[PDB]
Amino acid sequence: NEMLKHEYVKVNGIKMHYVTQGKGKLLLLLHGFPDFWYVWRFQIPALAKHFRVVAPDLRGYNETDKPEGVENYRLDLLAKDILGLIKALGEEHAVVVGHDWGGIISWTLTAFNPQAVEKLVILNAPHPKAYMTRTKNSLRQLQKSWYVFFFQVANIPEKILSRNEFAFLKNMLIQSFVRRDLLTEEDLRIYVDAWSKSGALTSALNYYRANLNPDIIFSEKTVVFPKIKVPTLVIWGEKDVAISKDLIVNMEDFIEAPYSIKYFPECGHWVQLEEPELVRKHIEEFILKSDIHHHHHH
Amino acid sequence: EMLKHEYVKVNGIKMHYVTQGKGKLLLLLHGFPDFWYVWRFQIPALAKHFRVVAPDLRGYNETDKPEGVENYRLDLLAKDILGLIKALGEEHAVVVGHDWGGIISWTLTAFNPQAVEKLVILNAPHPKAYMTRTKNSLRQLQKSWYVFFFQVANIPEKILSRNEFAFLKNMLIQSFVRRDLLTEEDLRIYVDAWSKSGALTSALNYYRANLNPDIIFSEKTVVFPKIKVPTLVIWGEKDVAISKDLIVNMEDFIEAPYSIKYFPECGHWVQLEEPELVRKHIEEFILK
Numbered sequence A: 001n002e003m004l005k006h007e008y009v010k011v012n013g014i015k016m017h018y019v020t021q022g023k024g025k026l027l028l029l030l031h032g033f034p035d036f037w038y039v040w041r042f043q044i045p046a047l048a049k050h051f052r053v054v055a056p057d058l059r060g061y062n063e064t065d066k067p068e069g070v071e072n073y074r075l076d077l078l079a080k081d082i083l084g085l086i087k088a089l090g091e092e093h094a095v096v097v098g099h100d101w102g103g104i105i106s107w108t109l110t111a112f113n114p115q116a117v118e119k120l121v122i123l124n125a126p127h128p129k130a131y132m133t134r135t136k137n138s139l140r141q142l143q144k145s146w147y148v149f150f151f152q153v154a155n156i157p158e159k160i161l162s163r164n165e166f167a168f169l170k171n172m173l174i175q176s177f178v179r180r181d182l183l184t185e186e187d188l189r190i191y192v193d194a195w196s197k198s199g200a201l202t203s204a205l206n207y208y209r210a211n212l213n214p215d216i217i218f219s220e221k222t223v224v225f226p227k228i229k230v231p232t233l234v235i236w237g238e239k240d241v242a243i244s245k246d247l248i249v250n251m252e253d254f255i256e257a258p259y260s261i262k263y264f265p266e267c268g269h270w271v272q273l274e275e276p277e278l279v280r281k282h283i284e285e286f287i288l289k290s291d292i293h294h295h296h297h298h
Numbered sequence B: 001e002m003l004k005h006e007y008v009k010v011n012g013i014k015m016h017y018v019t020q021g022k023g024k025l026l027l028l029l030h031g032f033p034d035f036w037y038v039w040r041f042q043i044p045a046l047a048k049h050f051r052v053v054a055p056d057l058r059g060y061n062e063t064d065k066p067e068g069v070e071n072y073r074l075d076l077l078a079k080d081i082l083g084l085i086k087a088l089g090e091e092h093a094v095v096v097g098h099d100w101g102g103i104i105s106w107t108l109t110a111f112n113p114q115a116v117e118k119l120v121i122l123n124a125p126h127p128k129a130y131m132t133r134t135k136n137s138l139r140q141l142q143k144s145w146y147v148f149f150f151q152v153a154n155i156p157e158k159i160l161s162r163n164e165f166a167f168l169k170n171m172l173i174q175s176f177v178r179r180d181l182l183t184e185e186d187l188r189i190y191v192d193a194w195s196k197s198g199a200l201t202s203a204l205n206y207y208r209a210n211l212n213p214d215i216i217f218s219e220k221t222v223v224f225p226k227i228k229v230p231t232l233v234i235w236g237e238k239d240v241a242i243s244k245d246l247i248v249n250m251e252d253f254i255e256a257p258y259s260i261k262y263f264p265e266c267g268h269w270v271q272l273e274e275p276e277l278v279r280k281h282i283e284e285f286i287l288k
């Protein structure tokens, strides 16, 4: 049957790497910082039983192209990469699942391009308008976002994050997990391989510099963000060291469509690694649910 | 004898201070985003018994404000205070420091024990505890979000000062344990000091010079002599800016009588929240 394959495609001016397995509805899985496609290792084979799973490396990461310059990492361009990818895969629509930055991009792609997104899944990613509105008024979110401010400085964060074989990034991950020994030494080797790709760390930090700089966080302008019009599932690990529960209060207000949120009270930011089977189960059930209900109790 | 203003040349700069009282010299040193006025509740009461001197530190209020991040390095700040003691015609002082004033007081004391009779610290980490422990404390890194914010040029000054310092006012107000601790009058006086030409950038330069990420995440050992003079630490436990991680286990840092008084219901601005009890503890420590 279908085994995992690596592939490469031109999208929106760049060459993007992805892995894919399975046949059927296109299901994109989009990672965040400081991950790459491999973050989805527990979900790919299980979802490939039902779906055509595609897990790309985003702009800047791992095997994907890394344009120079902060302006090349603005949210608008990242979402246009994903629209480009759906087309380059020979499709018009996708179910889109996004974690962390992958989720911020997914919220954005869905709001501005609802025609490309059949259903939306978000894991532990604040709605961008909630972040931009609420952060400056939330001491707990400002505290949790200490590293967003750190990342704004040029040159020096890349140096600090990469010293002693990326000890800093390893520690960021390790201190974020609810369970000990979640990553093996072997997993850490694989992550260092990706982090070490020339230009990867600078490009990753450029997402923060382009979209979460202090002028934006403390802006007096309100952000324009259309309501979400496609069925949405949010999966949320509650012990998230990066996102305050302040930012998810009344999240459903952003959605004018069927909306479900599944809380995982004992899991953290990396919910897909902490309860990988229950995450997979919830995503599958959501996608396979019929949108037409004309045979109650048959 | 009432509170009087003075100005004195020290270490290349002119420093403004207020003073009241006669006898043993007692220095009160403010931190960010304060000035001498933060000591308003303690100065008259302590002046009954001591020669109280409360300066504006380098960069602040009516004190000189040299240009350039390098001019705010800790060694220069402590040398300003050594210079002040001498300019006041003394050879030593009792030194009380809050926040940056406390970081400076730890530094002055460690390197110049001859200039310090006794040391009082209010809600200020030992600089070497900060430099050693912060990188290993998620709670301290989180509480220091604003230290990272302040590293970037120009933009923090803009944000902090917009809408008549609404941002800075909010930083203070969110830090206090009680509502309406500052009167409208107090806020006018704070705004007046924040508005002094160059004050805000010079204040932020302390963080850029001393708490930049190269320092915080350095793996080098910091060389800091043990404190050799009697020390009292006063600590408001509801401090939004400092984790209890940084103040425990001072034994390695202090080779002299040391005591710590915890204020479980007070925050970072302990001298404003419990002004009488703070003053009482200071007075008893110096006299007894």
Ligand SMILES: Oc1ccccc1Cl
Binding pocket: A032, A033, A099, A100, A101, A104, A124, A125, A126, A148, A242, A243
């Ligand atoms: O580090 C990213 C962006 C800041 C919000 C937390 C995650 Cl999604």
Ligand SMILES: Oc1ccccc1Cl
Binding pocket: B031, B032, B098, B099, B100, B103, B123, B124, B125, B147, B241, B242
């Ligand atoms: O804002 C200052 C310096 C960083 C530690 C907290 C206070 Cl003393």
Ligand SMILES: [Cl-]
Binding pocket: A004, A005, A006, A007
């Ligand atoms: Cl392959």
Ligand SMILES: [Cl-]
Binding pocket: A263, A264, A265, A266, A267, A275
């Ligand atoms: Cl759970």
